[PDB]
Design a protein around this motif. Structure first.
Motif, mmCIF file in Angstrom:
data_model
loop_
_atom_site.group_PDB
_atom_site.id
_atom_site.type_symbol
_atom_site.label_atom_id
_atom_site.label_comp_id
_atom_site.label_asym_id
_atom_site.label_seq_id
_atom_site.Cartn_x
_atom_site.Cartn_y
_atom_site.Cartn_z
ATOM 1 N N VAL A 39 -96.415 -23.159 -51.850
ATOM 2 C CA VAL A 39 -95.816 -24.554 -52.413
ATOM 3 C C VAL A 39 -94.673 -24.705 -51.351
ATOM 4 O O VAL A 39 -94.416 -23.931 -50.238
ATOM 5 N N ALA A 40 -94.094 -26.015 -51.339
ATOM 6 C CA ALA A 40 -92.987 -26.377 -50.472
ATOM 7 C C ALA A 40 -91.945 -26.828 -51.258
ATOM 8 O O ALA A 40 -91.863 -27.563 -52.430
ATOM 9 N N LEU A 41 -90.664 -26.307 -50.968
ATOM 10 C CA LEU A 41 -89.678 -26.563 -51.703
ATOM 11 C C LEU A 41 -88.552 -27.584 -50.917
ATOM 12 O O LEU A 41 -88.368 -27.457 -49.908
ATOM 13 N N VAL A 98 -90.546 -28.641 -56.488
ATOM 14 C CA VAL A 98 -91.783 -27.833 -55.787
ATOM 15 C C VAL A 98 -92.840 -28.686 -55.596
ATOM 16 O O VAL A 98 -93.076 -29.651 -56.375
ATOM 17 N N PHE A 99 -93.458 -28.697 -54.514
ATOM 18 C CA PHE A 99 -94.631 -29.596 -53.950
ATOM 19 C C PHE A 99 -95.827 -28.734 -53.548
ATOM 20 O O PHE A 99 -95.549 -27.514 -53.117
ATOM 21 N N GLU A 100 -96.779 -29.346 -53.543
ATOM 22 C CA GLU A 100 -98.102 -28.742 -53.031
ATOM 23 C C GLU A 100 -97.901 -28.686 -51.469
ATOM 24 O O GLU A 100 -97.587 -29.540 -50.729
ATOM 25 N N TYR A 101 -98.242 -27.437 -50.883
ATOM 26 C CA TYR A 101 -97.909 -27.364 -49.624
ATOM 27 C C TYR A 101 -99.112 -27.898 -48.716
ATOM 28 O O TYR A 101 -100.243 -27.902 -49.116
HETATM 29 C C1 LIG Z 1 -93.680 -31.937 -49.257
HETATM 30 C C2 LIG Z 1 -94.680 -30.802 -48.274
HETATM 31 C C3 LIG Z 1 -95.715 -30.334 -48.405
HETATM 32 N N1 LIG Z 1 -96.373 -29.510 -47.184
HETATM 33 C C4 LIG Z 1 -95.763 -29.768 -46.345
HETATM 34 N N2 LIG Z 1 -95.948 -29.673 -44.902
HETATM 35 C C5 LIG Z 1 -95.572 -29.324 -44.002
HETATM 36 O O1 LIG Z 1 -94.121 -28.802 -43.886
HETATM 37 C C6 LIG Z 1 -96.177 -28.833 -42.701
HETATM 38 C C7 LIG Z 1 -96.720 -30.344 -41.940
HETATM 39 S S1 LIG Z 1 -95.101 -31.020 -41.428
HETATM 40 C C8 LIG Z 1 -94.948 -29.435 -40.700
HETATM 41 N N3 LIG Z 1 -95.561 -28.334 -41.427
HETATM 42 C C9 LIG Z 1 -95.645 -26.967 -41.470
HETATM 43 O O2 LIG Z 1 -96.499 -26.415 -42.382
HETATM 44 C C10 LIG Z 1 -94.424 -26.397 -40.873
HETATM 45 C C11 LIG Z 1 -93.429 -26.613 -40.417
HETATM 46 C C12 LIG Z 1 -92.905 -25.475 -39.518
HETATM 47 C C13 LIG Z 1 -94.045 -24.597 -39.392
HETATM 48 C C14 LIG Z 1 -94.337 -23.455 -38.503
HETATM 49 O O3 LIG Z 1 -95.106 -25.056 -39.929
HETATM 50 S S2 LIG Z 1 -93.943 -30.720 -46.441
#
Ligand SMILES: CC1=CN[C@@H](NC(=O)[C@H]2CSCN2C(=O)c2ccc(C)o2)S1
Lengths: 327, 826, 248
Positions: A39-41, A98-101
């Motif tokens: 996930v993305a926080l 929380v978001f889908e990564y």
């Molecule tokens: C809301 C969101 C869900 N998914 C997200 N995607 C990201 O953050 C992706 C695409 S922008 C950079 N990135 C990375 O994975 C990253 C940053 C640093 C390193 C090593 O990898 S934001």
């Protein structure tokens, strides 16, 4: 239950790193311990409490609470830091969304100048992009800035739209001021540059058109640092804003204040003569100066370019995960 | 906020291109050899070449052609840089004085266009009426060579064929026309279009199209007597002249791709072809004369002349001597004899021009105990691979150790008085089911040798069928003596195993010094390797012994010794291993916020990680906890080629766009976000791809010589052979030398009238930015070569800060003192 | 993925307020005063009608999870309006809401805000968001009263009288628990149903199905007259208790 957000703690999400930085917090990549999903926080800090929970964060919470389209990023839940139950007046803990990564952002992939987007890849890309935007516009939710960093795409090929609010770029120490805004300018519509007006769905479609051209060149079509120099680049390609094409250009505040150097003829088809005909017709329609004349999202989906694209045929993009050694 | 200084220690040594024409002396034939940013002009002699002049240009030389328009006495020179700076140049020799004139100049970049796959192409009409440029897909740009076009203004003609391979101006046609091989879904075809300057568009060419080989690569413009064009592919060479069609498919050229062609004969009966395996071929044109007297090309024949260095370009000196210019090997002057020698070869080498080749890796080691420093570099590829030793005792002494195979990495092990070197050789699937090497090389000429017996991956149960004639890489480890540079041992790694990383170090409480190698199981099917081995070797008593092996789930791109522990990067993971008392590796901690962790550098408990697409990450090993922690990450998306740590706060990085940049901490600024942000304080287009960053210098210091304002020494190597050096400055010295640059640029005349500020500007295809935090030391060191009137013009109105006196001024002799001291750092 | 924001009338006998000794009448009174406080405060500030309602809906829902004895109602109301402003894109600074709240409240009532009014409110926004489970989207009867009226065709003046009279009933419903009992689509039908009876209008005639006597079923499926009669009864009990009479 699952619908009850705001009670689970962030203590259920192992943090892998800080993927991005925001104005009111940071963006961390994480794994839910139980689910095993990545996930993305998004951190929202109400600790300054100047004017409360950010309205920008509220926009992302409101819009994406009810939007579940494949082509738009989905907010799974909202978790909090460890909170003392004695009183919540004492507590000043932050809230995490929380978001889908997503694996990569379009900006990153094109910054390489190594990835290759074929026609079919662009078709797959644009159709998802427009299908999502239609769903949002039909729900009367408009993404005011659509950038290249905002377009998030995983390795498989799915495209998702993100950063409706709480953008993921932060400027610190000494650097170019409002660098994120400089990127936003590259995709701003002419109407907004000329005047504040009202937020129209066309502001989304213009940006997506800018993206369309960028996918055929790997470079943003319009790059400038000041609103006047941007309007001039647009005019060198699309033609100067005049009543002959824009019956309501006069109503805009800075039509006479901001003026292209000359009155240019439209050269879009000439400078893009290397683009397929089905696509070039889409670009020409997506980059119409007048908002009313600018094509809608549904109309893009019914273009020759995107109408008969097969959603089932994902056709992953070719991304270089080998030969990074080189030669 | 940070201030650094970059100089060239060895200029580019790789031949990008070469053309011959009457430039300097209208009478004498002149050979023009091009290296990145560097142009060298020579004069042909019966013995070799006499150098006339060497000039430096701001820009990567992309196009170089010699053309003489009607009314000129001597051929002029056209050059186009990779940043689209165009110019026409003329030699002027006022007796002893030599001056390169800029007759015309301009930038031909288009606001909108897709960069082409096969790169910039430049051709000139035989009638010298126009210059043809292929810069973007689906567009053909024309610079008409009219006397009044001093700014090189140009227009674009729409081109239906988007994916073009090569294009040459045809010879003998009534109207100028271009013959271009193009690739559409139906294969590749040859098509010609007439170019009109009056109409400014294409008109139909003589032959509409013809179906050509799928891998048609080169177009040869046959001279006017023969006419037509020759198309060179992988298996077949064809000649197209309207109704006439010739096809010659010898089975000798199928073995190696041909990459270069040259016109041996002005009439065109003889042409020169060179393949990747170095072989030199002669294209023979057989002439049948029609009864009215006209000439028809009866047949095409290819003869093997011999072996040369892998030739990026080939040119003929008209003395029976051919200049072989190589980017992967040492350039040469060869002699073509009419009679073959006793080995069957018609070629004999005359001179050898040293090429530092691609510097894949390099290490600094004081071999001869001089307490100075010698640089051993992994240089070359294929049969031109070698190890090069450089010392600064004015010239740099270079000793070449031939390997005849590609050298990937190098690391020095003093305890064993020897070097460890990873290498790879090419073998071909043979009729035995196994493979056979095209030539002996280091990994086969070792005094002792071993083949890996690991069974970690034995139960593959995966399909990898072999087809006869396919190439494979066999990776080996080479133990090499530091004095004799004799190959003492060679370890052949497993089948399909690539060696990617190498280190020499002790670990934990183990007193033995080991060679440790990180590998990856490379199968053509895999987009990213998913198997890998970390292997611990001990070189003892002329024998390499496998001490331990650790299986991993990816490619071990980079390793480095970290306070007795082993720090390795496996795909996206960054891992820290401990060396147990049982002589086995044990994982301690991991970090996974990465796409691909290609490069690793350390200092104390701090680690710099260079991600493929997310620039650099500053990591730290928190000992109290036994975990990695993220101090700060640069959020810019710059791709990475190599990384280096300058100090506890500054970090250096090299982009794939040839732009160096420096990132600093925010020095514990109040906000936690600011602390976690790495600001790009330094930006600088270098113009050369940096494979390896290393610390140290080759300057001799008897004992703490110091006496240099410069602080720190970082040496780097490039694909075109440049060995540069980066160092840090104080604020006061930066501002002084920066102010001097701005004064020098106004005074110094650039070739092609190219602005220096533009040349060093950070340039990605998408974003172009002014360069900051860097002093172009090559510009500063030119102050010693400008005339006295210019010297005084530069120092006029000089100002000083933080000096002995806080406000001061310096004369032409005072600056000379500084520059001469700055020349002593390399 | 979205929570259930509707209870049964019988359930209101078990709100935290009731169980802490508060009688049904008192909670009903507290609800009215809180709703009207939000309505009056925002009206002084010139806020769109949706923003007023959204704040009132947050308010009503809030006291299904908490007791009036432990959360002073006017503070909650001000917080609801403050958040409502940011949700509906009609934002106001907290200090301005406090300023307006003081102008309309006496000395005793404003005592609920304590020594630092702005702080007592800003601190409550943390709880409010968790209480509403972060479902910040709230549709209101207004949009449906218009969407359905647009499909009516007939005497312009009779339809406009129906709308305004219904609109008045919507405003009056915001003071009662109907918002927590029946979805907004049903409320907009119920008010149309109510205005029709009072004006002696036969709405079906204005529909595309002029002989479909249950005219609403083409707007809202599966609504029995039982529901409309209850919704309407409650709306008009307010008028009977109050000195105010039907608008007409
Ligand atoms: C809301 C969101 C869900 N998914 C997200 N995607 C990201 O953050 C992706 C695409 S922008 C950079 N990135 C990375 O994975 C990253 C940053 C640093 C390193 C090593 O990898 S934001």
């Amino acid at each position: 239950t699952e619908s009850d957000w705001g009670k689970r703690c962030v203590d259920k999400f192992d943090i892998i790193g800080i993927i991005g930085e925001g104005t009111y917090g940071q963006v961390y990549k994480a794994k839910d311990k139980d689910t095993g999903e990545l996930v993305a926080l998004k951190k929202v800090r109400l600790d300054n409490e100047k004017e409360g929970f950010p309205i920008t964060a509220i926009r992302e919470i409101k819009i994406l609470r009810q939007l579940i389209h494949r082509s738009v990023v989905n907010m799974k839940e909202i978790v909090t830091d460890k909170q003392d139950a004695l009183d919540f007046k004492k507590d000043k803990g932050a809230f995490y969304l929380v978001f889908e990564y997503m694996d990569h952002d379009l900006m990153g992939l094109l910054e390489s100048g190594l990835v290759h987007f074929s026609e079919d890849h662009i078709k797959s890309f644009m159709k998802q992009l427009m299908e999502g935007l239609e769903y949002c516009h039909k729900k009367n939710f408009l993404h005011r800035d659509i950038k290249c960093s905002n377009i998030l795409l995983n390795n498989s090929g799915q495209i998702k739209l993100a950063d409706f609010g709480l953008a993921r770029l932060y400027n610190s120490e000494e650097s170019r001021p409002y660098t994120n805004k400089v990127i936003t300018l590259w995709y701003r519509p002419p109407e907004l540059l000329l005047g504040e007006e009202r937020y129209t769905p066309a502001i989304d479609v213009w940006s997506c058109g800018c993206i369309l051209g960028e996918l055929f060149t790997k470079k943003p079509i319009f790059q400038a640092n000041l609103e006047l120099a941007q309007l001039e680049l647009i005019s060198r390609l699309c033609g100067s804003p005049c009543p002959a094409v824009w019956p309501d250009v006069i109503r805009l505040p800075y039509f006479n204040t901001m003026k292209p150097k000359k009155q240019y003829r439209r050269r879009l088809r000439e400078e893009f003569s290397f683009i397929p005909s089905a696509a070039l017709d889409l670009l020409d329609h997506m980059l119409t100066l007048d908002p009313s004349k600018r094509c809608t999202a549904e109309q893009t989906l019914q273009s020759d370019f995107l109408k008969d694209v097969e959603l089932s045929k994902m056709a992953p993009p070719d991304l270089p995960h080998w030969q990074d050694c080189h030669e | 906020m940070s201030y650094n200084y970059v100089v060239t220690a060895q200029k580019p040594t790789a031949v990008n291109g070469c053309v011959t024409g009457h430039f300097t002396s209208a009478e004498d034939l002149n050979l023009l050899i091009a290296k990145n940013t560097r142009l060298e002009i020579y004069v042909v002699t019966a013995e070799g070449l006499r150098p006339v002049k060497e000039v430096g240009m701001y820009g990567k030389i992309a196009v170089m052609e010699l053309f003489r328009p009607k009314g000129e006495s001597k051929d002029l020179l056209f050059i186009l840089t990779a940043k689209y700076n165009a110019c026409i140049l003329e030699y002027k020799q006022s007796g002893e004085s030599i001056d390169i004139i800029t007759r015309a100049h301009g930038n031909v970049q288009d606001r909108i266009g897709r960069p082409s796959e096969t790169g910039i192409i430049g051709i000139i009409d035989p009638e010298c009426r126009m210059i043809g440029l292929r810069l973007y897909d689906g567009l053909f740009k024309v610079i008409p060579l009219d006397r009044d076009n001093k700014e090189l203004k140009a227009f674009n003609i729409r081109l239906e064929e988007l994916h073009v391979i090569d294009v040459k101006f045809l010879y003998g046609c009534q109207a100028p026309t271009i013959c271009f091989v193009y690739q559409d879904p139906q294969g590749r075809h040859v098509k010609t279009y007439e170019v009109s300057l009056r109409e400014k568009e294409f008109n139909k060419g003589p032959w509409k199209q013809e179906n050509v080989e799928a891998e048609a690569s080169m177009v040869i413009a046959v001279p006017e007597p023969f006419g037509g064009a020759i198309i060179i592919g992988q298996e077949s060479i064809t000649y197209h002249n309207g109704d006439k069609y010739l096809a010659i498919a010898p089975p000798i050229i199928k073995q190696s791709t041909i990459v270069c062609h040259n016109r041996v004969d002005p009439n065109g009966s003889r042409y020169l072809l060179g393949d990747m395996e170095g072989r030199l071929f002669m294209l023979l044109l057989e002439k049948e004369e029609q009864m009215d007297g006209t000439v028809t090309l009866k047949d095409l024949r290819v003869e093997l002349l011999g072996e040369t260095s892998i030739a990026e370009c080939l040119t003929y000196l008209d003395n029976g001597v051919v200049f072989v210019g190589s980017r992967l090997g040492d350039s040469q002057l060869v002699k073509l004899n009419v009679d073959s020698n006793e080995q069957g070869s018609y070629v004999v080498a005359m001179e050898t021009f040293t090429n530092l080749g691609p510097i894949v890796d390099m290490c600094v080691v004081d071999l001869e105990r001089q307490g100075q420093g010698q640089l051993v570099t992994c240089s070359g590829a294929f049969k031109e691979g070698s190890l090069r030793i450089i010392r600064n005792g004015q010239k740099l002494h270079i000793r070449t150790v031939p390997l005849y195979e590609s050298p990937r990495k190098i690391c020095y092990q003093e305890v064993s008085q020897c070097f460890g070197v990873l290498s790879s050789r090419i073998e071909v699937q043979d009729t035995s089911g196994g493979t056979t090497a095209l030539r002996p090389s280091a990994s086969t000429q070792a005094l002792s040798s071993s083949v890996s017996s690991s069974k970690l991956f034995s139960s593959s149960t995966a399909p990898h069928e072999t087809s006869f004639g396919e190439e494979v890489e066999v990776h080996n480890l080479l133990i090499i003596d530091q004095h004799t540079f004799e190959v003492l041992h060679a370890h052949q790694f497993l089948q399909n195993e690539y060696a990617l990383s190498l280190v020499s170090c002790k670990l934990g409480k183990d007193p033995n010094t080991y060679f440790i190698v990180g590998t990856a199981m490379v199968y053509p099917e895999e987009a990213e390797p998913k198997q890998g081995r970390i292997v611990v070797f001990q070189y003892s008593d002329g024998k390499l012994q496998t001490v331990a092996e650790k299986e991993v789930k990816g490619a071990v791109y980079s390793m480095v010794e970290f306070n007795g522990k082993l720090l390795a990067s496996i795909n996206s993971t960054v891992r820290l291993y401990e060396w147990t008392t049982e002589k086995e590796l044990r994982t301690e901690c991991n970090h996974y916020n990465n796409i691909m962790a290609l490069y690793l550098k350390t200092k104390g408990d701090f680690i710099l990680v260079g991600d493929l697409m997310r620039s650099v990450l500053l990591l730290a090993y928190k000992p109290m906890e036994g975990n990695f922690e993220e101090i700060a990450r640069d959020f810019n998306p710059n791709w990475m080629s190599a990384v280096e740590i300058l100090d506890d706060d500054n970090f250096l990085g090299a982009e794939n766009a040839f732009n160096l940049f420096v990132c600093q901490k925010d020095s514990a600024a109040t906000t936690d976000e600011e602390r976690q942000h790495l600001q790009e304080v330094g930006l600088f287009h270098l113009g050369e791809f940096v494979n390896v960053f290393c610390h140290g210098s080759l300057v001799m210091q008897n004992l703490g010589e110091t006496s240099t304002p410069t602080q720190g020494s970082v040496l780097f190597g490039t694909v075109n052979g440049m060995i540069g050096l980066v160092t840090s400055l104080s604020e006061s010295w930066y501002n002084l030398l920066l102010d001097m640059q701005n004064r020098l640029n106004k005074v110094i005349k650039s070739v092609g009238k190219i602005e220096h500020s533009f040349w060093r500007s950070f340039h990605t295809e998408r974003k172009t930015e002014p360069a900051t935090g860097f002093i172009d030391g090559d510009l500063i060191e030119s102050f010693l070569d400008i005339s006295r009137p210019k010297m005084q013009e530069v120092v006029a109105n000089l100002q000083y800060d933080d000096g002995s006196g806080m406000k001061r001024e310096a004369t032409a002799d005072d600056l000379i003192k500084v520059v001469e001291e700055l020349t002593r750092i390399h | 993925t979205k929570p259930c924001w509707y209870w049964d009338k019988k359930d209101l006998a078990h709100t935290p307020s009731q169980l802490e000794g508060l009688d049904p009448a008192t909670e009903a009174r507290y609800r009215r005063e809180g709703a009207r406080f939000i309505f009056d405060v925002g009206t002084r500030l010139g806020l769109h009608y949706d923003t007023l309602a959204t704040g009132i809906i947050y308010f009503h829902r809030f006291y299904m999870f908490h007791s009036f004895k432990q959360f002073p109602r006017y503070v909650t109301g001000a917080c609801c309006l403050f958040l409502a402003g940011k949700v509906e894109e009609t934002p106001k600074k907290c200090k301005d809401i406090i300023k307006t709240a003081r102008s309309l409240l006496n000395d005793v009532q404003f005592g609920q805000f304590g020594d630092d009014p702005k702080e007592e409110v800003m601190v409550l926004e943390r709880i409010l968001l968790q209480t509403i489970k972060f479902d910040l989207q709230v549709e209101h009867p207004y949009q449906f009263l218009l969407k359905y009226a647009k499909q009516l065709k007939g005497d312009k003046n009779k339809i406009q009288k129906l709308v305004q009279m219904a609109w008045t009933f919507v405003n009056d419903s915001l003071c009662t628990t109907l918002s927590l009992q029946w979805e907004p689509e049903i409320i907009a039908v119920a008010v149309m149903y109510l205005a029709g009876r009072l004006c002696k209008f036969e709405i079906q005639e204005w529909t595309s199905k002029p002989m479909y006597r249950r005219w609403w079923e083409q707007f809202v499926q599966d609504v029995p007259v039982d529901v409309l009669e209850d919704i309407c009864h409650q709306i008009l009990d307010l008028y009977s208790q109050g000195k105010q009479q039907m608008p007409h």
